[PDB]
Design an enzyme around this catalytic site. Sequence first.
Site, PDB file in Angstrom:
ATOM      1  N   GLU A   1      -0.850   4.652 -12.570  1.00  0.00           N
ATOM      2  CA  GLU A   1      -0.213   4.020 -11.424  1.00  0.00           C
ATOM      3  C   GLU A   1      -0.410   2.517 -11.524  1.00  0.00           C
ATOM      4  O   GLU A   1      -1.530   2.048 -11.748  1.00  0.00           O
ATOM      5  CB  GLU A   1      -0.784   4.550 -10.105  1.00  0.00           C
ATOM      6  CG  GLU A   1      -0.559   6.036  -9.897  1.00  0.00           C
ATOM      7  CD  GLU A   1      -0.977   6.502  -8.518  1.00  0.00           C
ATOM      8  OE1 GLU A   1      -1.392   5.653  -7.702  1.00  0.00           O
ATOM      9  OE2 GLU A   1      -0.890   7.719  -8.251  1.00  0.00           O
TER      10      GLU A   1
ATOM     11  N   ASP B   1       3.324   6.910 -11.649  1.00  0.00           N
ATOM     12  CA  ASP B   1       4.242   6.024 -12.355  1.00  0.00           C
ATOM     13  C   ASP B   1       4.416   6.423 -13.815  1.00  0.00           C
ATOM     14  O   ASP B   1       5.511   6.268 -14.367  1.00  0.00           O
ATOM     15  CB  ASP B   1       3.754   4.578 -12.259  1.00  0.00           C
ATOM     16  CG  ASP B   1       3.762   4.056 -10.837  1.00  0.00           C
ATOM     17  OD1 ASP B   1       4.663   4.441 -10.064  1.00  0.00           O
ATOM     18  OD2 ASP B   1       2.865   3.260 -10.490  1.00  0.00           O
TER      19      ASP B   1
ATOM     20  N   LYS C   1      -6.352  -1.063  -2.040  1.00  0.00           N
ATOM     21  CA  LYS C   1      -5.303  -0.367  -2.779  1.00  0.00           C
ATOM     22  C   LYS C   1      -5.889   0.416  -3.947  1.00  0.00           C
ATOM     23  O   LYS C   1      -5.487   1.558  -4.209  1.00  0.00           O
ATOM     24  CB  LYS C   1      -4.256  -1.366  -3.269  1.00  0.00           C
ATOM     25  CG  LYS C   1      -3.024  -0.726  -3.886  1.00  0.00           C
ATOM     26  CD  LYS C   1      -2.255   0.087  -2.858  1.00  0.00           C
ATOM     27  CE  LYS C   1      -0.957   0.625  -3.434  1.00  0.00           C
ATOM     28  NZ  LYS C   1      -1.192   1.536  -4.587  1.00  0.00           N
TER      29      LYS C   1
END
Length: 2010
Positions: free
Chosen positions: A102, A89, A115
Amino acid sequence: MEDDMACVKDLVSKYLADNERLSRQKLAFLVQTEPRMLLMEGLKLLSLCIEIDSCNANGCEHNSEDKSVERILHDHGILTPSLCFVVPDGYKLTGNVLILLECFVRSSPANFEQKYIEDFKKLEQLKEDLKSVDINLIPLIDGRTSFYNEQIPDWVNDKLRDTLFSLLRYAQESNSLFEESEYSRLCESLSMTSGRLSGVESLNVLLDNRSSHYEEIIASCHQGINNKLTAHEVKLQIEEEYQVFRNRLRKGEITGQFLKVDKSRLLNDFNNLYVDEVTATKDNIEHLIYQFKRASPILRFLYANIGHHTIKECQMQYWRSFLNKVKSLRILNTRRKLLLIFDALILLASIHDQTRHKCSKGWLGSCFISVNDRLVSLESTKRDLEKWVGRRQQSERPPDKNQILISMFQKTILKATAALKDVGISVEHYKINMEVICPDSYDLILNFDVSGVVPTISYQRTEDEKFPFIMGGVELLESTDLERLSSLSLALVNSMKTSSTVKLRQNEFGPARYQVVRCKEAYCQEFLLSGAEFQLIYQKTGECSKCYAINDNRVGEICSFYADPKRYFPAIFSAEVLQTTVSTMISWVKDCSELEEQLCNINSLTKMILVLILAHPSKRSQKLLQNLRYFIMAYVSDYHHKDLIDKLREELITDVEFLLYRLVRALVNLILSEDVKSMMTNRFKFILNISYMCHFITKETPDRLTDQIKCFEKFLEPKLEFGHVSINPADVATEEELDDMVYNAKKFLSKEGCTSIKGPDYKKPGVSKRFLSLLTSSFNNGSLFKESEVKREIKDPLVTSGCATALDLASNKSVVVNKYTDGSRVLNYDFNKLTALAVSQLTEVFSRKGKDYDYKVQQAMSNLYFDQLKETVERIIDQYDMGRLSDDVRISERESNSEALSKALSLTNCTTAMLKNLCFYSQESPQSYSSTGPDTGRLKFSLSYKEQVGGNRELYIGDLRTKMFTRLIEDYFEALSLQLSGSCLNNEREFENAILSMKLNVSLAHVSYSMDHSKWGPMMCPFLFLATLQNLIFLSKDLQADIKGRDYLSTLLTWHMHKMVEIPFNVVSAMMKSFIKAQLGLKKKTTQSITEDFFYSNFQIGVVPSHVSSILDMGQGILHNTSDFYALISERFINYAISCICGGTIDAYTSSDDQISLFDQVLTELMQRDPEEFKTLIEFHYYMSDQLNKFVSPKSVIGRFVAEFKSRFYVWGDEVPLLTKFVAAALHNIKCKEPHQLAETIDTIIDQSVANGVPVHLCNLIQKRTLSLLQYARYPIDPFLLNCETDVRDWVDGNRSYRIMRQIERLIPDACGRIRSMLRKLYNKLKTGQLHEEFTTNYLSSEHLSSLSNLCELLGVEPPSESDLEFSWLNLAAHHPLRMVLRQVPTIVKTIQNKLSSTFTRGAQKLLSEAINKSAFQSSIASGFVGLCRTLGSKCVRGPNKESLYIKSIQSLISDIQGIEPLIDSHGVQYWRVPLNIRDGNEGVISYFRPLLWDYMCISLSTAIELGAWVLGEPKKVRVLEFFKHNPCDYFPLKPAASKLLEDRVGLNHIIHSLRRLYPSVFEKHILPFMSDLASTKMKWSPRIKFLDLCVALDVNCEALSLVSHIVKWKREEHYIVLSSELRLSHTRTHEVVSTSDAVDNFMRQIYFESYVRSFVATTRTLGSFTWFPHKTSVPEGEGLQRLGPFSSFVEKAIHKGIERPMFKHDLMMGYAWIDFDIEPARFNHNQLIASGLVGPRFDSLEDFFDAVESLPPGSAKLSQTVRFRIKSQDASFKESFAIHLDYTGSINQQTKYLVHEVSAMYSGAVSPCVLSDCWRLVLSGPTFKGKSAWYVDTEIVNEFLTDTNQLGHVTPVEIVVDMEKLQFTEYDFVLVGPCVEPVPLVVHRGGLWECDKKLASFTPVVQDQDLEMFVKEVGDSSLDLLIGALSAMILDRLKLRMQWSEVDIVSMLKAAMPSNSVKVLNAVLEAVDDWVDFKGYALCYSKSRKKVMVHSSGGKLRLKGRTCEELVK
RNA sequence: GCGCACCGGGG
RNA sequence: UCCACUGUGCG
RNA sequence: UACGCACAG
RNA sequence: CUGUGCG
C-alpha cells in the site's frame, strides 16, 4: 479562470506519459469542472502514478481493477474464508507467501504516523485469517512526502499542484479547510466495488462424492430436449401446433375453458347457487326484514322492546370496589373466611341501602353479586356464617354472636385500612360509610329474606315462544341495535379477565347439568341499556368458547347462547363509525335515477348485512363476501373462466349463513338489475366494497387442530393424486426411493397434448419436452431479447452478487432444532409410545366426561388386536407419568433464529460473520457432499399453518442450514433475474411503470387481461427449475464460468429436490386416536377420507408416517425468486409465440404469479371484427400456459372496462377506493403494550387508510373511538396521543409531529404565535450558521422557562407572558417508563457502533445476545385491550428513586394542592395550569409536570428541520367559493409537496466524519476498530456541514431527544386518493424583512414568468436587471446558491466576481461528473446489399440469407455500428451526449461468422477530440471486442429479404472476428460529421434555457395563486391573446413533464383577476391545450363536438377521452 | 344456538 | 406447547 | 442499526 | 403478588 482550467487540461494532456493503465483515471480528470473535484482527481492521478512506479520498483503487479484480497486469491485458485474488505495497491503471491503493498503520500509529520499505523492495523486484520488457511502475509507499507515520480517531470508536477491550489482558492471561498487532513482523505475516495464472491463456489471446498444417481438425473434432464433450434424451426413447430389445435377445437374435441360474458346468464347462475337448500329464488324484502330480527338469540335481543337512581351511587358499589381493591392485596390468611367476610359486608351495605331508600341494585332475584364478580345466594351465605360463628363461639370457651361478628369486622377493616393507606390512598378515596356496621348486624342479616326470580342458564336450543319481549320494536334506521351490540360485546370481552377463584359448588347433577341449570353460584358482568340493568351470567373462566346467559331482575333467562369471547372486539365503542360507513356507501349510489324508489331497501339490506357479520363472526361466512369480489369482477368483463360459478359456491351450515346469502342475493338483484344503465362505475365499486366487508370478522383461526388437519390434507392430496409419496426417508437414501425419484423425474417430463390421440389433459402437473425445447431454444438464439437489454454485456452472477451477513437471518421467527439420540438425529416416531399416549389420552378424556359397548370398552381400557394393545400399554406404562411420555414422542423442537445464530457463531473462529463462514468454515461443518445433500444430513422442513382472511394455507419451517442454503439459492436467482425487464418483485420503478401502462391501456379502451395462477407453490418443483437451468446459456461466448456456475446451482437444486418434510405431531396423534376408535367399533364408517385411508394403511402394518419426500411440491414461498424468473421467461416466450401466430403484440408484467397483460390495437380490432379468431387465440394461450406447468386461475378476467394488478383497481378512468377493508383494519384488537405505542400504531394505520380513499370525517371518529378505549381504562389523556380534528393536508403534507403541533396550537392559540415568530427568526439565523453558540448549552442544555424567555428576548421579539408559562401537562413516567404486568456512552455513538460492528463476529454476538434478552423480556408482557386495562391501575407509575404507585395516588396527591388547576376540552384532552409560586417545597409531585411551550418549541423546530420551513408560517382557514357540486364519490390522486432535494440528504458518512473531526478520542476508541475499506470510506461534501456539526454536538452533549435523526429522513412521495370536496376545504400555511430563500424564489418565479411574455439572451446584465436578485448579500454561503438550478453555477462564478460576459453551455455542468456508454447493434444497408448481387426472390429463412450473402466478393459485407457516450453530473439536470460510428468492411464466413477486413471511425458531438481516444480505450476495456461477449445485429433490414416476416426478434447474435491492432485509433482516425459550429450563448425562451434551436435544460419552480393572479393582471391588461398563449404554453410544458397544477385553482384565479372575461379566456386556453389537466381538486377538458368545457365527475353523463364528464357551466 | 376433519369445547 | 420466506410504509 | 404493527404475494 | 373501569 476558464483559461487556467484549459491550460491545466492542455499541460496534463501533453505532458503526462501515455500509459494505458493511467488512461482511465486521466479520463476522470479531463471531464471535471468543479475546482475541488478537479483538485481531487489530480491528486488521485498523482497518487496512482506514485503507486504504479512504486509497485514496478518492488516488482508487485499493480491492482488496476481494484479487487479485494479474497477476490485476488480466488483468481489464483486459492480457497479462503470470507475476509474483511481490503483493496491493496499491489500484490505478489509466491507459492504460499503473500505480499501486499500500500502506497500513500504525506507531507505532514503529524499526519504521517497515524496513516502508517492505520494501514498496519488494516493488514493485521487479514493477517490472522490468512494464517488460518496456511498463507503467510508480509505487509509492506510505502510512505512518501513529495509527489515526485518518473511518470512526469518535477517542474510540471509542481506547476500543476500550485495551479490547482490557486484555482481552488480563487474560484470559490466556501471551506478553506483543505489542510493535509481533509483533501488527503478525499483523495482515496475511489473505493468503488466491482462485485463480491457469492459463496456458492465455496462448495468446491468440500469433497465431491456425486455418483450414478446425479448423472442419471442430469441425463434425464437432457433426454429429448433440443436447445439449439433456430428461429425458423421453432416458428414452424409453433405454426403446426396452432393449426392442429385450431382444427381440433373447431371440430369439438377440445373444451373451451372460457365463456363470453352474458349478464342475464351470470345473474341466473348466481341466483341458483344453493338451489337445493333454499326454497325460493325471489324473496320479499319485508319478509327478509321480518325474519332477520328473529333469527338468533342475539338478534332477537338486539331488536326487542325493553323498558335517575341509576346515575346515583349507593353504598353497595363503594363497598364492592373497596373490598375488591383490598382483596387485590392478597392477605391470603384463609380464602374461605375472607370471602365470607366480604359477602357479609356487601350484604350489610345492601341492607342499609334498601332500608334507607329502597334500592334494587346488585340483586338478581334471590342472589347478589359478591366481591370477585361472583353471583351467590343468600341462603348459603347465612348458613355458613351462622355455622362459623357458632363454631368459633363454642371453641373460644359468654359473648354473643353480634359482638364477636362486629369485632371480626372491625379487625378486618382496620387491617385493610393499614395495608392500603401506606402506599398512596386512604379509605376516604372510596366514599364508604361505617354506619353500615350495626350493633345487631348478625341478627339483622339472619332474618333477612328476599323473593324474586331464579337465574338460569339454558344449555340446549328450545322454542322461540319463551321470549318475554316483543321481537320487532326497534327499527333498522336507528343506531339502537349497534349500541346494544357494543354493550354486549364489551361485556363479553370483560368476561375473559375474571380470575379463576375457588371452584364453585355443583348446581346440578347428572344430565340435568346440561339441560337447564338454576344458578346458585356463578360469575356475572353488568351492563345497562336504556336505563335497565342486565347481567351476563357464565360459569367458566378463560378465553375458551363457552355458554352465556342474559338475565334481568324483572324476568330471568332472557336468552342463552354459545360464544367465543375473543371474536367480538370490533363492535366495542364503535356505533357512529359503522353508521357513517353505511351512510357513505349509500350516498355513493344516491344519484342513480333508476334506484330512487329502492334506496330504503338498499340501506336496510346493507345495515342488516353489517350487523349480521358483526353479531355472528363465522369463518365460512367470511368466504362468500370474498368470492363476491370475483363475481363482480367477472360481471363487467368480456370473457371469463367457465369454473367461476363452481368456485363461488362455499359450504354453509347454520341458518344465519343462508340468511346472509339471501340478503346478499337480494342486494345484488336490486343493484345489478337489467333496467339500470346509468352509473356503472359507482355500482361496481359499491359491490366491491360490499364484498370487502369480510375483513370485519377476524384473522385468527377458530380451531387449531382442524386447521392443521385441513392444511395437511391440502399438502398431501395432490402428491397422492400424482403418485409419488416416499414414506419415512432416511439420511442414507435407499435404492428403492432413488429409483422412484428417477422414475418420477422421467414421468414429470412426459406430458403430451394436441398431437396424441387422447389430447391435452388440463390441470395436470408436468411439462412437455416440445415446449421446454422451444422455450430454451428461443432464449438461446436471442429471439426473446429487447433492444434495450443488449446495450451492455451480461455480468456473471457468480462473481457479481454479494454474500449475506449473519444478521440478515436474525429475527424472533421460529426455527427447527433436531434431536440426537446417540450419534444421529431422530427421524421416526415410535409406534408403541405413540399408541400408549393415544390410549392414555382416550382414557383421560373419557374419565373427565363419562361420569353400552362404548362404556364397557372404555372402562376396560381405563384399567391400564386388543391383546396387542393391552400388552404394549402394560409394558410401556410400567417401564416408562404422562409429561415425560408426552415430551418423549416429539422428534424436533423450536427456537428463535437469533438463538441458533448465536450458537452457530460460538463455533466459528473466523473474524467476519458471513453465511459462507458458517456453512463451510466451522467446527461443525460438512466434510463431503452427495447428490442427496451434505454428509451432515438431508435438508429438513416441518409443516405448519397460517392465519389469514380466507381459506387454508400450509407453511414450511426449516432449520438453520437449510435456511442458509435456500438464502444462497435465492440471492443467486435474484441476481440472475435482475438483468431482465418486466419483473416487479424487486423493482418498484417497474411496478410504477406497470401501473402507468395499465392506466394508459384502460384510458384507450384496449383489451386487458388480469391473471392469477392456481396453486403456484404446491405445483412448481425444483426439478423443473433444474431442467430449465441445465438447458439455458447466459454467457454464450464465455463457456467456462457457465459450466461451474450451472454445476453448483444444479447441486443445490438437487439438494432441494431430496428434502424431507415433517408431519406435525398433533395431526399424527389425532389420526392415531381416530384409528384406535374406528378399529374398536366406536366410530361410524362410510366417509373414510383418503388421508384417513393412507394413515390407517400405514398403521395396520405398524409404521408411523414421520417424514414425506416427493418430487412435486415446492415450499410455500421458499423458492420465490426462482419462481419469479421462471414466470418471467415463460411469459416472454408465450407472448413471443402469440405474436408469431397473429399480428398483434402483448405487453406483460408479472411479480410472482399475478400478471397484467395489455393488448395492442390489432388484437382489440380482431376481437371487434372476428370473435372466433380472438377466442381461439385465448384458447391457444391457455393451452401453451398449461403445457409449461402454469395453470390459469378461474379468477382471471379479460375485458376493456376494469383492470387490476396487485389489488389496485381502475375502472373507465376512475379510482376505486378501498374503504371497508381499512375501516375494519383500524377497528381490530391491535396487540399493544403501552398507550403511546397504541396511539402511534393507530396513527400509522389511519394514515394508511387515508392514503386509500377513506374520508377524514370517519378517521376522526376512529381516533375518537381509540381515545374512548383509552378513557375506559381510566388513563389521563395527554395532548401527545392523538389529534381528532385533522384535515387532508394534515395527512398528505404532514407527519405525526405536524399533527401534534396542530393540536397544541388548537389548545392554546394567541400564545404559540410569538413562539412561531421566534422559531422562524432563530431557524433563519441558524441555517446561515450565525449564532451556533447560545443555542448549544446556554438555552437548550439548561433550565426551560428562563432559557426560553432569554432565547425569545435575544432575537428582539416580545417574550411570552407569565400566564403562558403556567401551562403544563402531566407527564407520567417522567423518571422511569411504566412497569407492565408480566403474565409469566452517547446513544448516537452506540447506534454508529451497532451499524458498523454488525459484520464482525464479536459485535454480532453482542447484538444477538442483547436482542435475545430484549425479546425474552417483551414476550412475557400481557398485550391487547384486556392486558392494557389490567396493566393500568396496577401500580405502574415508577417513583422518584425506586417505588411503585397507582395512578389514583398521583391524582390524589395533585388534588391536595389548591394552586393546580385542571383544564379540559371537548375531545377530552386534559392539561394543567401550575403557577410558578407553588413550584418550590412540594417537589414530590411537581416533577411529573412539563411545560407545554418548551415541548411545542422543540417539536416545531424538529419538524421544520425534517419537513421544511413552511411549517413555521401562520396557519389560516380560507373561504373558498364553491362553483361545482361534486358527486360524493369523486376522488382525486394527489402528491405530497416536497422541499428537500437530493443534495440536502445526509448519510452515514457525514455523521461518521463529523464525529471523527469533533470528538477524536471517542471516534478512535469506538469507531476506529470497526472501520474497513468499505463504502464508509467514501467522503462526500455537502453545503449542510456546519449545521450538521451543530446537531451532532447537541446530540452528543445531551440525550434528551434526537436531532440528527430528523435530518437523515425525508417526506415520502406517493399517491394519495382523496376527496375533492374535502381537499378544497383545507387550511393553508402562508410564508411571509429579506430572506435569501425568499429572494431566490422570487427571482426564479420572475424569470419563469417573464420567460413566456418575451425571450431574451442570458447575459450578465439581463439577469441583474430584475428587482429580486441576491446582489452579494451579507451571508450568501451555499444556502442561497442551491435553489437556483442551472443558474447556480453562473451567478457565483460570474455575477459575484466582477465579470461581465454572457452565459455559455460550459456554465451548465455543476457537481462531480462521470461518463457512461452504450453499444447499439449493428445494421445492414439495403442499397449496398441490393447493388452487390443480391437481387431476386426473397429468402426462406435467415440461414438462406446468410448463405446468399456469403456467396459474394470478399468485400461485399458492410456494417455500421454506433457507440453513444453520455456525461452526467452529480446535479443531474443536463447530460452531455455524443457518439462514435464504426464502419466495418469484411466478409461473412460460414453461417454465424463475420470476418472484418477494414474499420473506419467517425464521430459526432460537441466534445473535443483530444479526449476521444481515451473514451475509445474505455470501450476496449470491455469484453465485447475481445470475443468474450455476444455481438448483435439488428433484424429490421433483414426482414425486407424474407418471404415470411414475424419470424425473428429484434436482434440476432453474430460473433465478430477482428484484429485488436485495427481497433486502436489514436487521435487522428476520427473524422467529424457534424456542422462544427462555434458555441452560442443560451437563450431564455419558454420553459428553460434554449441553445441554437435545441432545448438543453429547463427550470420550473412552484407557482401559487397570488403569483399567477399578479402575472395575469400584469399581462392581460396589455393584451388578451398574449395571456392566452402564455397560459397555454405553460400548461403544455408542465403537462409534458408529467406534473400537476394541484396547488392552483385556475377558475377562481381567472374569476378574481378578470371578473368579466374569465369564461372566454378559459375556453380559449383549454381549446389550445385540448387534454385532461389536473388542478387543485378537479380536472377540466375541452370538447370539440360540443364547443364547451367539461369537468370530470363520476356522476356525469358524457364520455370524453376515456373519462366520464359533464358540463362545467349550465 | 361455539367448533362443525363424525372425533373438540361447554362448573 | 404454537405462526415460515419475501415486498412496501411508519414509529 | 434492531424491534413492533398494518397491507400485499 | 397485580382489573372492578360504559364517551
